[model samples]
Target: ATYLIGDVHGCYDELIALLHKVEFTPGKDTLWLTGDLVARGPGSLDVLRYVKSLGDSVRLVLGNHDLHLLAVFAGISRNKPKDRLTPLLEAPDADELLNWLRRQPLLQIDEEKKLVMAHAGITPQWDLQTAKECARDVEAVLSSDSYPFFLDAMYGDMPNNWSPELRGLGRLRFITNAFTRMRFCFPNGQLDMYSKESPEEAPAPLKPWFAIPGPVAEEYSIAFGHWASLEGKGTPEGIYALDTGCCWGGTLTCLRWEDKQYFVQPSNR
Candidate 1:
C-alpha cells in the first residue's frame, strides 16, 4: 500500500512520530511525500537523512521551498539570513542530500492506486500528458550539470500562464510555479501568487486550482500539499491536501492510499 504525506517543513521529530503512529514499515509499505521536506523549522538535515535512508520505500515530489533551498545553497537564489535553514546547509551530508533531492520528480503517478501526486495543485487547463511533459522539462534541467545556470534564471513572475510559444527558462519557470508555489488561478488559468490566504479570502479573480470547471482526467486521484493555509483540507473531491503545518505547531498528516484512511500526529514544534 502507499501512504501520502504533506510538506514536512523540517519537522523531523514530528515526522518520525507520525510514521510510528502509522506503524509504517518501509519494506512492506511505500511513502509518497508531497515535498518541501526542509526549511522553516529545526532538523531539516535530519529529516532529509532519515527519508533518504528509507531508499526505495520513500518517494518525493519537489515543492517550492525544496527548490528554493537548493537554489539558495547553489547560489542561484539569495538566502534569507533569518530563515531557519542553515543547519541543513551545514550538514555533513548536505551535498549528497541536495543532489538526491534535486533528482526528485515534480510529479508522480501510481496507476495501481490511481493516484497522481504533485507538490502543488494542478490547473484544469493541462492534461496529465501535458503536465508530465512540463515536469520532465524541469527535471531535465534540474538534473543536468548546467543545473546551476537554469537555477540562475529561476526567479520570476512573468509568463505566469502557460503558452505553447514559451521557450527556455520562461517555460520552465511557469511549470515550476504551477507545480510548486501555485495555490489559486483565474478561470482562464492565470496564476495568482499574491494571495497566500485561505481560499475563502482569495481575490474575486482567483479560485482554488481544482475549482476550475472542466472534465479533468478522472482515472487518477491527485494529491498535493504546499498550501498550508488549507490546513490539510482537500479543496475538491478526489484532490487530496496533506499539509497541516506541523512546523507551525500543527499536526502532520498521512493518507494510506489502499484504504483511503488518514493518520495524524501532533507536533510540539
Candidate 2:
C-alpha cells in the first residue's frame, strides 16, 4: 500500500499514533507525506529524524513551514516565537537533515498511480507539465550553490499572478507560492493570501484552489495540507484534504492509497 499523510506540524506523537492506526508495515508499504512535516508542536526534531530514518520509503514535498525552516537556517528570515524548531536547529544532525530537506522537491508525482502531492494547491493556469516545470525551476535554484539568493528573494507577494514571461525571483517565488502557500484564489489564478477562511465562509469571487482547477487533479489525484480550515472537507473522492489541523488542536491525518482508507489520530498537545 502507498499511504499518504497530511501536514504533521511537529506533532510527532500524533504521527506515531496515526501510523499505528494504519497498521503500517515497514519495507512493504510506501509513505507519501503531504509536507509541513515540522513546526507548531513540541517534537519538530523528532518528526524530522523519524521521517529521515524512513529513507527511500518516503516521498515528501516542501511546504510553507518547511521552507520557513530553510529561510531561518539561511538567516534570511527570523525564527518564529511559537514553533519548537530551536531543538531541531541545535540537533547534532541538523546540518545533514536540513540539507536533505533542501534537496526535496516541491512536487512529487506518481504517474503510475495518477497521483500528485504537494503542501498546498496548484493553480488553474498551470497544467501538470507546466506546474512540474515551474516546480523544477524553483528546485534548481533551491538546490544550487546560489540557493541563498532564492531564500532571500523568495519572500513577499509581489507579481501575485503567474506569467510565462516572468523571470528571475519573480517567477521562482510565484512557483514556490503555487506549490506551497496557495489555498484560495480568484478565477484568474491570482492567490488570495489574505483570506484563510473555510470554504463556506470564503468571500465571493475567490474559490478553493482545487475547486477552480487548472491542470491539477483533472486526471490525477491530489493530496495536500497547509489549510487546516478545510478540514471539514474530509476525504473527498479522488481528493485528499489530509491536513486535519493536528497542530491546531485537530487530528493528524493519513490516507491509505490502495484502499482509500483514511486514519486520523487525535491531538492531545
Candidate 3:
C-alpha cells in the first residue's frame, strides 16, 4: 500500500521522525509527497538530498515554495529578507538537487488506486488528464533549456481563469498557479493569490477549490498540501490535508492510503 504526506517545508528532521513513526521501509512501502520539500525553515538542502537518495521509493509533487527555489536558483526571482532558503541555494549539491526538483511532476496519478496527488488542490474545471497535461507542460519547460523564459513568466495572477486559448507565459502562469499556490478561487476559476487566512475569513463569493460544484473529476481520491492554515483538517472529505504546519509548531500528519488511517507527529519547532 502507498502512504501520502503533506508539505515538508524544510523540516527534514521532523519528516524522518514522522516516517519512522509510520514504519515506512524504503523498498516495501511507497511514499508520495505533496511538495514544498524546501524553504521556510532550516534543512531545506538536507530534505532535498534525503528525498533524492530515496530514488523511486518516493514520489514528489511540486509546491509553490519548491518552484520559488528554482526561480531563485536561476536568478529569476530575488530572495526576500526574511526567507530561509539561502543555505539551500548555497549548498554544494544545489545544482543536482534543484535539477531533480525541477523535473518532478506537478501531479501524480495512481491509476490502479484512482488517487490523484498534487501540491495544491486542483480546480473542478478540469479532469485528471487535463491536469496532468497542464503539469507536464510546465515540467517540460522547467526541465528544458528554455526554462528561464518560462520562469520569467511564472509570476503574477492575471488571466486567472482557465481557457484553452491562453498562450506563452500566461499559460505557464495559469498552470503554475493552479498546481501550486491555489487556495480559494471564484466559481469561474479566477484565483485570489494574496490571502492565506482561513476559509472563514475569505470573501463570501470565494470558496475553496473543491467546493465548486459542477462536472468535477471525482473518480480519484485527491491528496494535496500547501495551505498550512488548514492546520491539517483539510476540506471536510477525504481530501487529505497533510500540511499540519509542523514548521510553525503544529503537528505533521501522514496518511497510510491502504486503509485511510492516519498518524500525526507533534513538532518541536
Candidate 4:
C-alpha cells in the first residue's frame, strides 16, 4: 500500500508516530511526502536522515522551504533564524542529504493511479503534459552544475502567467512558482504570489489554484501541501489538500491512496 503524507516541517516524532499508526513497513509500504520535510519544527536533521534512510520506499516533491534550503547551501540566500536550519546544515552527512534533496522533483506523477503530486498545486495555466515538461526542465538544471544559476534566478515572481515564448530565468521562475509557492491565482492564470489565505478568505477575482478551471484539474487528481491554512478542507473533487500544518501545532496528515482515507497525528511539539 502507498501512504502520501503532508508537509512534515521537521515533525520527526509525529512522522514516526503516524507511520507506526499506519503500520508502515519501509521495505513493504511506499511513503510519498508532500515535502517541506525540514525547518520550522524541532528535528529537521532527524527527518532528513530518516527519510533518506528509507531509500526507495520514499518518494517526495520539493516545497518552497526545500528550495530555500538549497539556495542557502548554494550561497544564493541567507538562512533565516526562525527557520532553524543550522543543525541540519551542521550535520555530518549534510552534503549527501542535500545532494539527494536537490535531485528530487517539483512534480511527481503516478500514471497507474492517475495521481499527481506537487508541493504546491499545478498552475491553472498548464495541462498535465506542459506541467511535466516544465517540471523536468527545472529538474534538469537542479540536478546539474547549472543549479546555482537556477537557484539564484529562482526568487522573483515576474512572468506570473505561463507562455511558450518565455525564455531563460523567467520561464524557470514560473515553473518553480507553480510547483512550489503557488496558492492563489488571478482569473487569467496569472499567479498572485503573495496571498496565503484560504478560499473563503481569498479576495475577489482570486481563486485557489485548484478552484480555477484548467486542463490538468479536469484530468488528474492532484495531491499537494504548502497551504496549511486550508487544514485540508474546501478543496474541489479530485483535489487533495494535504498540508495540515504539523509544524504550526496542527495535525500531520497522511492519505492512504489505496483507500482514499486520511490518517492524522496531532503535533507533539
TM-score of each: 0.96, 0.96, 0.95, 0.98
Residues 1-269, candidate 1: write the lDDT tens digits.
68888989888888898888888898999999999998887878898899889889998899888888989879888887655889888888889999988988999887777778899867666787888899899999999988888777878876788877889878887888888988888889888868888888876878888778534445567899998898877466788989998888888899998888999988876
Off by over 4 Å in 1: 214-217
- Which parts of model 2 have CA positions greater than 4 angstroms off? 232-236
Tens-place lDDT digits, model 4, residues 181-227: 99998988899988888889988999888888899888889999999
Highest TM-score against the true fold, candidate: 4
Per-residue error at 148 for model 1, in Å?
A: 1.1
- Cand. 3 Cα-lDDT: 0.83
If both were scored by lDDT, which would come out higher, candidate 1 or candidate 4?
A: 4
The candidate, 3 or 4, that scores higher on TM-score is: 4
Best by lDDT: 4
**Across residues 1-269, which tens digit of lDDT does each residue of candidate 2 receive?**
88988899999998998888877777998898889998899899999889988988999998999999988988888898797799999899998899888888899889999898888866777888888899888888888887777888888777779888999878888888888888888888788778888887999998888777565667888888888998838434567788889999998888888887777788876
RMSD of 2: 1.4
Tell how far residue 38 is off in model 3, in angstroms. 0.7
